[PDB]
Symmetry: D2
Subunit: 248 residues, 4 copies
Amino acid sequence: NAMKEKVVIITGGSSGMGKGMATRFAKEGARVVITGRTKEKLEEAKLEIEQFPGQILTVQMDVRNTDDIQKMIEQIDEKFGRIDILINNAAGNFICPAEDLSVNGWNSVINIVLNGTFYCSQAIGKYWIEKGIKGNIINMVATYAWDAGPGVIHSAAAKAGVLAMTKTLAVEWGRKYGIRVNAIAPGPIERTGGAEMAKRTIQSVPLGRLGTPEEIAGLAYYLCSDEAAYINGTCMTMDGGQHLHQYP
Amino acid sequence: AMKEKVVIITGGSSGMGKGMATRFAKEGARVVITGRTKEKLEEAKLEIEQFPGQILTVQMDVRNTDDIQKMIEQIDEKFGRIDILINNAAGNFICPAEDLSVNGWNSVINIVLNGTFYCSQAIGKYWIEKGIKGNIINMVATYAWDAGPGVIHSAAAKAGVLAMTKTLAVEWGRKYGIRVNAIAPGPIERTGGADEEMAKRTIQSVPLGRLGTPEEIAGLAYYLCSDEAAYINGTCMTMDGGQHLHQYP
Amino acid sequence: AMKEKVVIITGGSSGMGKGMATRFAKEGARVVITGRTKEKLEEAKLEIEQFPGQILTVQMDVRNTDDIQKMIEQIDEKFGRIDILINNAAGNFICPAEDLSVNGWNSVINIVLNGTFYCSQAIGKYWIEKGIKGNIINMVATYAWDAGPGVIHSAAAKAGVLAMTKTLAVEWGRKYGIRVNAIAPGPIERAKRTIQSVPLGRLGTPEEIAGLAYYLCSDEAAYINGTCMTMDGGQHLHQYP
Amino acid sequence: NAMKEKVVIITGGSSGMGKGMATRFAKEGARVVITGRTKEKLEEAKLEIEQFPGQILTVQMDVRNTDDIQKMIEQIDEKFGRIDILINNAAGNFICPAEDLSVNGWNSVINIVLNGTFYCSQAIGKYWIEKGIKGNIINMVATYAWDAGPGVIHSAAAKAGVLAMTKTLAVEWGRKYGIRVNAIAPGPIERTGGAEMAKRTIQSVPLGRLGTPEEIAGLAYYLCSDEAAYINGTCMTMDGGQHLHQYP
């Protein structure tokens, strides 16, 4: 189909936004690699999105482990022979007052979100550099990445770091290798996990509703299209206007 | 579908304006292009029209509120609806801030900032009275949120337009379900202003090593108006190959 | 060196303008305050003047380029120099964007954006002719870089001023050594859900704002250029996740 | 509340900006604690900065080690009985193309700059919470923290994370404890030693010169003064206008 012969890797692709993006790329005929930490969820996701035999590759791995990343790259290269797009979506988040956050809790989020995104990006980038592939990277961030994230200080710091990495790689690798690097910052999206009623935040969104995984997937698809080839080093926000000041 | 929609593009007879008009027309929308000169409007129409009467040319000035109401009336009478407004009409040139005439400064503030407000408010009120969930796209520049040396007039005006964009996304998004966003293009071929050492140097300044195109800009505006994009509101989408970012540490 | 300096504060007869004027006069500078109404200027003068001839009141409109040149002539004749310009003259009120009259929108753009440009260009040219390394401080608002629901006129105007601030910081900083910066105040003294909205749990004060403007004009702050210093107790930041 | 009665901690206080800040606070009469990894540098800085015996406390410690941090707080509390200000300055930075950066290299910068700043801030904050002290935190960032940092991707990410932390703590702790948290972003400063011609750098600064440690010190001192009590959750840039676009 439209994305046929392209190979897309989505970390954290067995649930939520990751799986919504995975669904769209598979419907457009691309080969999709989804990663996760649990076998069962990956199998389920694969059964839900696979359009033809061999289209989807599930990889049980940890983005914090550089050996796992290299093994995944070798496995994909052997099965499909190329990698076109990397979407760094694997994340970990929960609320905790900053004073009460354990050192291990802080470390775990920085490790999965910031470090794991860098490990995946550098390893995939090096693969593209060696093969002369003009790849595309999309990093999932949050609107609190450029502001305050009260109650989620670990995620706010990690995602801010990811946003800086996004812009830095867009300049360095855009120039030296023609690799495009961008981010997406979603607002509240229906059908996603986490940790007095919802109308408390649906109200905070000017458009008065939650976004959908299909809408996020449409943005990801547009960013990977030939039309969008000049978009580089930006963060596309999709939050119905939530992050803006709602009163004067 | 896009086939039934009506799109207004101010300054639509040349440059990015015409690139956007070309795309919406190929997708079958009715397109209204505005401009100050009759000749350029007729040239653009002939070039982009897919079928008789698809394109409506309106010779007008975005600084004139009477021109804006006349245009709305004419469109409503002819097509019976308005779905999308793209505020593109612009004016720009280089001048050191201390040398800029009061008339030069005023003219750019009036066309870019005031004209965008006049058009947006008039169209918004038309949508409000008819219960239409419209969409507005404002064309800004990457210097709108930083410094614009040599183009202080445009930097100020476009910064005002960006603030307006975000403010209307909140006010109208909430009260009427009207979406408002902006596009910040980088250097785009076939859109030269007034003003090669610095020429090839500016291409060097773009990480991707090339100029953007009006067709790429048109594809972003088209995506922003699609049903898939319905949750995008109050943002500025930059399309500049990474140019506005720091190029060295 | 403050003793030998001349500071111009537009809209200096009330509120923040008066707070700034009070501090600069206490530090011994000559202060020029502008305003539209005679009696308010006369009251402000009596309140802040520390010695005879310290304060020059000028009844003028920042939208009038002829008024600006007359003021510059008058200042130059009386004091012989101008060191600092604070563009504070502002106008503001709440109104839904779709209800705002063309005259209402135009008046705010004219006073805030155009007036700041007219004053800044006229003073810049004066400094350019005399080789003076001046300092400009523009008063903006935290909604200048975000949305300002209900105050779209002021948000647009202030955002324009912020862009002008950064642009002149580059052009004039490099060519003439003139520094240009902005201050963004939060809610300032002179129902309480907005006090709750401020992490520090209170309103700011005009004395605090004046202390920031004073620091920005000091020799210690000579490398600060093209930035916006916000003083709002943390209010503009997201208060929830 | 008078500076003469205050205790100021400056990590990385034995050289460069840290020492410039140390010099100013000591000159105003505060007790100053400077941290560093080398005994000799610490003793040299102490001799240079101290106005009276016992005014300066040097602490040889690693900001990445939470035990070192805990021991330092005990030592200061025992000697001085209070802590008023924390300046997170310790940092590590060098140039390296993103694709050539080692995993250890990346990890070390994130650890020292981002994690170390969180460890010190959380530990000192907890100390302040226990004692009811309305403390003040200043984090040293850089202007590439909110943009691209080509060649310094590690520091750009770490510093972006520090900036997010700064804003997040200003909200959470400003509200719950009256603790202020702000950042400073310096431009190029003479006498600071991080790892073509230098006239290129001064040329990129509109003001056409480098900043000084004494200027940076004045900004830090202003931010800690009583008149700056309402400044919270912001980043004060001191770079001569360098980070702005220099041409259309």
